[PDB]
């Protein structure tokens, strides 16, 4: 007689696994009532209500924009300026970053210690960030100290001292910062991508600038920079949280009196020094780094181009992923599926960067040396596929994800104030959520195919790579993989 099906150890294990499988064979319908794996385009313009964003223009062209939440206990107030490294010159390059270092270094009324003691006595925070086309200084304070923060910002923008010893100390701080450009390889890769893609244009320069420029920086340089660029028509004062529009407007009218009023205007600056894309690559071969990092990019779209929304949808379609994400093998993005299913990268990330007259659309990846060939094949395949085959489900899911991320990231006074300032600088207005959603849902599969055929198909690419990249395919092989010869 044969043994019964629990005597032998392997038969018993087979019985256990079979019983578990039968348990999975019969689902419970109470837990299968609402969620669906099929994406549906939904219209919910009722929940989309938000507090009004008041925009007031002063007689000198200064704009004050507030988003009031008087139930909040905090607020974010700041200045967003249409200024950055792109609007400098070759010999002035780096001045904006130096000013960012020097702006909290004391004024006629306040010394460095007074300024820090005033701020951190109320528990506030002071932030300064400069980019290629945008500069912002803002304060996160309690609702009571809105007027004090506005006074602090107006003072530092209008009455900075720029002591020569302070300038010399910051000169060496920044020189050491330039000498220590390592450990942040993402930022390095993107800098080199900008430098080769926008070669011989103001957009190609780094924010930091060359070492000789920072060595040559003096007081009159910084004062001339502020006089040239920090003008009323180029500045937006944005407040979010527990703030009333009228009080902020009155305080701004009181404090921001001695501005520059230089006639230099950003549209003319972009017009006479335009940014163009040059298909090219920089390969920084270093076989001691454990991981390779590269970015591939196409020429993208400007802020105001209608195709920018479609490019955002396409970026969502490509997606982003790293090895610590649980479900990369199951996501809607085919590129993420390929990468996660075959373990061919440490991280992947699609980016859509916009500027006033151009943009960058591409993919940034981190991977081991031996994965590079397959990873590059997969990236190029899935990017080029956007010009040929787009399913309605994928574009619907991407639209839903994009709307969700845009609304979900907008939490807190600081992100709201940043959104207000950025939109006022790039669009001239804060685009209401309903209009943005309507523009997003106008991006269908045919729209994605049209935009991809305009920006991706048979197009020149810009590459920036660093690390053990000897097996990264050369420029001709990336350029060939931008079209499909079976169509």
């Amino acid at each position: 007689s044969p043994p019964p099906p629990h005597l032998m150890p392997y038969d018993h294990a087979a019985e256990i696994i079979k019983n578990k499988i039968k348990k999975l064979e019969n689902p419970d319908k109470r837990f299968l009532k609402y969620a669906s794996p099929h994406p549906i385009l939904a219209s919910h313009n009722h929940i989309l209500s938000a507090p009004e964003t008041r925009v007031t223009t002063l007689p000198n062209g200064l704009r004050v924009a507030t988003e009031s939440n008087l139930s909040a206990k905090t607020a974010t107030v700041g200045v967003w300026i249409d200024a950055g490294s792109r609007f400098e010159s070759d010999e002035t390059n780096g001045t904006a970053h130096f000013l960012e270092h020097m702006i909290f270094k004391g004024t006629d009324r306040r010394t460095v210690r007074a300024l820090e003691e005033e701020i951190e006595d109320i528990g506030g925070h002071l932030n300064a960030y400069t980019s290629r086309e945008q500069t912002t200084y803002y304060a996160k304070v309690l609702d009571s100290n809105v007027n004090q923060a506005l006074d602090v910002l107006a003072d530092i923008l209008q009455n900075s001292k720029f002591e020569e010893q302070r300038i010399n100390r910051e000169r060496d701080v920044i020189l050491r910062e330039m000498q220590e450009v390592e450990g942040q390889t993402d930022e390095v890769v993107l800098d080199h991508l900008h430098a080769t893609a926008f070669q011989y244009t103001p957009l190609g320069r780094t924010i930091l600038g060359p070492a000789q420029n920072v060595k040559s920086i003096t007081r009159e340089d910084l004062q001339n920079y502020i006089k040239t660029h920090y003008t009323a028509s180029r500045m937006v004062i944005a407040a979010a949280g527990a703030v009333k529009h009228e009080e902020v407007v009155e305080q701004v009218k009181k404090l921001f009196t001695k501005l520059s009023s230089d006639p230099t205007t950003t549209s003319q600056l972009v017009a006479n020094e335009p940014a163009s894309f040059t298909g090219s690559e920089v390969r920084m071969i270093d076989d001691d780094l454990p991981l390779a990092q590269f970015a591939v990019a196409f020429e993208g779209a400007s802020w105001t181009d209608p195709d920018s929304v479609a490019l955002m949808v396409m970026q969502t379609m490509l997606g982003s992923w790293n090895k610590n994400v649980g479900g990369g093998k199951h996501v809607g993005s085919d590129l993420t599926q390929r990468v996660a299913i075959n373990e061919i990268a440490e991280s992947i990330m699609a980016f859509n960067t916009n500027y006033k007259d151009t943009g960058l659309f591409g993919v940034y990846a981190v991977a081991k040396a031996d994965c590079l060939d397959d990873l590059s094949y997969a990236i190029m395949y899935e990017v080029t596929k956007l010009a040929y085959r787009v399913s309605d489900a994928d574009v619907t899911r991407a639209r839903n994800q994009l709307k969700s991320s845009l609304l979900l990231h907008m939490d807190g006074t600081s992100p709201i104030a940043e959104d207000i300032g950025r939109q006022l600088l790039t669009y001239g207005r804060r685009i209401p959520t309903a209009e943005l959603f309507a523009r997003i849902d106008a991006v269908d599969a045919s729209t994605v195919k049209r935009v991809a055929n305009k920006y991706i198909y048979d197009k020149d690419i810009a590459i920036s790579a660093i690390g053990p990249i000897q097996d990264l395919p050369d420029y001709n092989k990336f350029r060939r993989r931008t079209y499909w010869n079976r169509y």
Binding site: Y388, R389, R486, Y487
Partner: peptide
């Protein structure tokens, strides 16, 4: 709806190539 257009394009290509190798002008 692009595979059908690809098939039509390649069918036109195949016909053009046929008339080009064999050149049946004296038979048509």
């Amino acid at each position: 709806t692009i595979d059908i257009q690809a098939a039509a394009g390649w069918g036109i290509a195949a016909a053009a190539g046929a008339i080009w190798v064999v050149q049946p002008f004296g038979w048509i």
